[PDB]
Amino acid sequence: QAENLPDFTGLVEQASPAVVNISTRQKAQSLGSGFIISPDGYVLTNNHVIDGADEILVRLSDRSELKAKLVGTDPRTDVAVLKIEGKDLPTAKLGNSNTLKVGEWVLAIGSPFGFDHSVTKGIVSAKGRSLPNDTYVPFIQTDVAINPGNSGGPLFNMAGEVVGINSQIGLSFAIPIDVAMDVANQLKANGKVSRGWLGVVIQEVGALVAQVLEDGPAAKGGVQGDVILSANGQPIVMSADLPHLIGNLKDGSKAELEVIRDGKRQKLTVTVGAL
Amino acid sequence: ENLPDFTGLVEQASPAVVNISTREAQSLGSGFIISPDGYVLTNNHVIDGADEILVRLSDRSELKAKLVGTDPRTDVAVLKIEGDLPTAKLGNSNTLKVGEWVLAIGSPFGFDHSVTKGIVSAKGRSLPNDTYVPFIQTDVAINPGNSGGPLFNMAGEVVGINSQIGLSFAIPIDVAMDVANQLKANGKVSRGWLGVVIQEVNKDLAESFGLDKPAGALVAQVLEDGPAAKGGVQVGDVILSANGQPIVMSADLPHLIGNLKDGSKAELEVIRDGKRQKLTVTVGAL
Amino acid sequence: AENLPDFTGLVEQASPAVVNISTRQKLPAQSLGSGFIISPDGYVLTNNHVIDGADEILVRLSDRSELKAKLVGTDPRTDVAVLKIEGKDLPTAKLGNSNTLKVGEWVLAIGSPFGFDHSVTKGIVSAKGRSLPNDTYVPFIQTDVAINPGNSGGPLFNMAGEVVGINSQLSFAIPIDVAMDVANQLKANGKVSRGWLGVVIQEVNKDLAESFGLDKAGALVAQVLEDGPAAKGGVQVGDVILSANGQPIVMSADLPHLIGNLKDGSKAELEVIRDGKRQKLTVTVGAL
């Protein structure tokens, strides 16, 4: 049987070229991994790989070394966009992470310690939009091996399409490529991600306001202990349905939320903010 | 790729995997449904110390669980909820072969399932520090919250309980089902016990005897007030027979005696300073 | 509803030769790790770090036979050890080629961690090389098999059942080519002899190639030594050695590797860049 087991050698060969090493210099010190999403030198990575670096060097498989300026970064999704200078650079095909199915085979490729690629296989362990410690950023979980230096490299389906950005944090986490490409479009066009802001901490039940704030715009509209079942007309089946919605709202726009307090249903409007 | 994957197996076998929480609800681990009327398996060490036990299904229903019974030695616990629940098919762990693909499913933090693939790394009934529970070892990934959930063969049958207490450990489903039948019918596993603690027999400790095949159980510490003390057992005694069953394995001994009924005497054949003899012990319980 | 192939048949054919390595002396039966039989008359490979400090070495087969082992030889630098036990037609592991191992290939580590019983873990080839920021010599394979206590020193199998590495530990293995080289040396001489550098070197990126006039490679000596054979040759620190005895140096680790295979006392002709000028210096190579 075993000799008839398919393997990732062709996939490694076809999908490694676009994966790069991200380093900085004191003024060959590896910071992590990343990949090329366009032949003219746009590169994705993690915010936490480039944070604190000033001169950023991108190191290719042909072992070219290129100077990178930081196009933009988003700590909340932990996504960073760099730009280097080339023409017809090897570029990674991008896929859809919403069609990723739990149980599918995936392949992480990094360039952890200089120009060389390192490769690890696994499956999709889980997907979601939530954690007990956060209600914001959707995630993919895989049982791929954890490496220092692989963080920021891409996560491949068996067709060689990027389905995620392998961020390190025994299961390993990745940013769904749908979210990362969204964030990267934003950073590329504006330099920063804008997110509509609510002065509330929520918990599940709708979304159960567990801590409304002072000087939060929500306080200007209402008080704590309110189960928000819709905002701007969209049902809240999950508490995590709410922040992304508010996040996609433009600061200053009105948001109409329906809340239940004591069996009583009501509606309050808020001029949403940012950050 | 033409590589087969576990998506269909995940769909068929996740529904019966449940989250175990206590009392907002604090996730303790995973478990699975072994009968459509609500008997649920898990680890003892997932529910130890919990008082209010909540079982959280994939449909997001939450059900109250009474502790049917627990066995710390095998680390198996049986809970009961009230509902035609999705039920996990059970398999045979003795026919599990090292190198077979397996799939662990958990429900680690809330209603959502998490999944990891691997192979059977090893099987046994022994470790340098313990003789009393057989084990499966796999190279499945280790998760907190996956503990107590099932371990599936590629056909969707449970072959083990993922305990993981850098390879991960599972209780063979044969042993877990044995313990669960006992817990379900009596509330406690009753187990026959001998006072002496034994060690294996290698060719370095093969003296006090003329035995020329490393086998048996080398008593390393005989005890007081154990019925074994009444049998006439001395430290350095190689137990080759228990009730007629050969002891090629040191672990052949504990499991045998464990299934013995308390109060029933067990006739053992031992070699003491080269001489072969037989002494009977009224087995007890822990 | 999808059955991929598995490793059960591979486990059956390739486990028999994997053995446990133990020692016996101490104050209150001790497994040190794993190894494998590479010859039916009892030659056994393992890691240096498994037998280091042991006095009596015991080799334990799956048939539960226990055999006394004489230490044929060891090489800490590659972490390779060769033992000898006494048998005839012992189960023997087929050996393969590690240079043809491709990143992405499936591999199977087999160990015998605690006693006579075998443990098994699967994975792929994650990476290959001969260099790391912590060493400029040892070639390596990296795999994502599980890391186990007791598996170290056991073999790493390709899907055909040939040994491609020694699972030394992501997990590290010694490529079987290097290990067999080292084992032939230990078996015939008792020790591996290696030619001596006289200087520790560093890589050449773009910045250090602009530093000292280096157009576009080589090995940039980062620390020349005293009484090193290079010192007798005239090697000042900051020297890019591009060839030695005619062999191109594309990366720094090409160098020790070369010098390692040179016989002590033999000629070393090195081509260096010194403050923009090209030159050649001769060295009487040494040994560790």
Calpha distance A7→B2 (Å, rounded): 9
**Cβ atoms within 10 Å, residue A151:** 28
Place of tokens 């068929």: B12
Where does A1-187 sit in CATH, by number? 2.40.10.120
Contact B139, C146 (CB under 8 A): yes
Compute the C-alpha angle C156/C64/C84, nearest 5°: 60
- Comparing CB atoms, the residue among B6, B119, B139 nearest residue C6 is B119
Element (H, E) at B45: helix B44-47
SS3 state at B229: helix
Sign of the torsion angle spanned by Cα atoms A28, A31, A32, A36: negative
Beta bridge partners, A27, equal none
CA dist list (Å): B107 to A176, B58, B112: 21, 9, 6
Q: Chain C 11-70, CB below 8 Å of chain B: which residues?
A: 11, 24, 29, 64, 66
Nearest-CA distance from C7 to chain B in Å?
5
Q: Which of B36, B19, C170, B1 is nearest to A126 (CA)?
A: B19
Place of tokens 């260096």: C272
SS3 state at A177: helix
- Judged by a CB distance cut-off of 8 A, whether residue C8 touches chain A is yes
**Cβ atoms within 10 Å, residue C103:** 23
- The size of chain A, in residues, is 275
Please name the CATH architecture into which domain B101-186 falls: Beta Barrel (2.40)
Q: Which of C79, C177, C239, C254 is catalytic?
A: C79
- Comparing CB atoms, the residue among C104, C133, C170 nearest residue A9 is C104
Calpha distance C61→C90 (Å, rounded): 10
Nearest-CA distance from C191 to chain A in Å?
32
Calpha distance C169→B9 (Å, rounded): 33
Calpha distance A69→A91 (Å, rounded): 18
The answer to whether the Cβ–Cβ distance between B121 and C146 falls below 8 Å is yes
The amino acid sitting at C205 is: N
- Judged by a CB distance cut-off of 8 A, whether residue B162 touches chain A is no
Residues with Cβ within 8 Å of residue A136, at least 6 apart in sequence: A76, A129, A240, A243, A244, A247
CA dist list (Å): C175 to A113, B132, B196: 20, 40, 48
- Comparing CB atoms, the residue among B5, B114, B140 nearest residue A126 is B114
Q: Which of B21, B30, B114, B147 is catalytic?
A: B147
If you measure CA to CA, which chain C residue comes closest to A149? Answer: C170
Beta bridge partners, C141, equal C128, C173
CA dist list (Å): A87 to A84, B165, C258: 10, 53, 38
CA dist list (Å): C247 to A38, C214, C255: 38, 18, 9
Q: Contacts for A251-259 with beta carbons within 8 Å, 24 or more apart?
A: A251/A194, A251/A196, A251/A197, A253/A196, A255/A196, A255/A231, A256/A231, A256/A232, A257/A221, A257/A228, A257/A230, A257/A231, A257/A232, A258/A228, A258/A229, A258/A230, A258/A231, A259/A209, A259/A222, A259/A226, A259/A227, A259/A228, A259/A229
User: CA Rg, chain A, in Å?
Assistant: 21
Strand A265-271 relative to strand A273-274, pairing: unpaired
Calpha distance A228→B27 (Å, rounded): 25
Q: Which of C196, C243, C245, C203 is nearest to C220 (CA)?
A: C203
Calpha distance A77→A137 (Å, rounded): 6
Contact C127, C103 (CB under 8 A): yes
Contact C270, C256 (CB under 8 A): no
Nearest-CA distance from C129 to chain B in Å?
25
Where does C1-190 sit in CATH, by number? 2.40.10.120
Q: Which fold has domain B192-285?
A: Pdz3 Domain (2.30.42)
If you measure CA to CA, which chain C residue comes closest to A144? Answer: C144
Q: Known catalytic residue: C49?
A: yes
CA dist list (Å): C283 to C94, C226, C253, C265: 41, 14, 18, 9
SS3 state at C126: strand
Residue A90, Cβ density class (10 Å: 0-12 exposed, 13-18 middle, ≥19 buried): middle
The answer to whether the Cβ–Cβ distance between A171 and B140 falls below 8 Å is no
SS3 state at A184: helix
CATH superfamily, region A196-274: PDZ domain (2.30.42.10)
Elucidation method:
X-ray
What token pair was written down for B229?
Answer: 């003390």
What token pair was written down for C10?
Answer: 């591979």
Q: Chain C 165-224, CB below 8 Å of chain B: which residues?
A: none
The answer to whether the Cβ–Cβ distance between A11 and B1 falls below 8 Å is yes
The amino acid sitting at C50 is: V
Calpha distance C99→C177 (Å, rounded): 7
Sign of the torsion angle spanned by Cα atoms B44, B48, B50, B51: positive
Indicate the CATH number of C195-287 among 3.30.465.10, 2.30.42.10, 2.120.10.80, 3.90.1200.10: 2.30.42.10
Indicate the Cα dihedral angle B70, B73, B75, B81, nearest 10°: -10
Phi, psi (5° rounding) for residue A219?
Answer: -60, -40
If you measure CA to CA, which chain C residue comes closest to A148? Answer: C170
The answer to whether the Cβ–Cβ distance between A123 and B143 falls below 8 Å is no
Calpha distance B164→B104 (Å, rounded): 11
**Cβ atoms within 10 Å, residue C29:** 15
- Can you say how many angstroms the Cα of residue B271 is from the centroid of all Cα atoms in its chain? 31
Calpha distance B132→B125 (Å, rounded): 7
Residue C224, Cβ density class (10 Å: 0-12 exposed, 13-18 middle, ≥19 buried): buried
Q: Which of C190, C173, C245, C251 is nearest to C218 (CA)?
A: C251
What token pair was written down for B33?
Answer: 């449904």
- The size of chain C, in residues, is 288
Calpha distance C66→B42 (Å, rounded): 40
Calpha distance C177→B20 (Å, rounded): 51
Compute the C-alpha angle A201/A205/A207, nearest 5°: 40
What token pair was written down for A69?
Answer: 């300026």
Contact C179, C121 (CB under 8 A): no
- The size of chain B, in residues, is 286
SS3 state at A189: helix
Calpha distance B217→B219 (Å, rounded): 6
Residues with Cβ within 8 Å of residue C28, at least 6 apart in sequence: none
Where does B15-80 sit in CATH, by number? 2.40.10.10
Give A-chain residues touching B143 at CB under 8 angstroms.
Answer: 170-171
Sequence spans of domains, chain B: 15-80, 101-186, 192-285
Kindly list the partner chains of chain A, i.e. chains with 3 or more CB atom pairs below 8 Å.
B, C
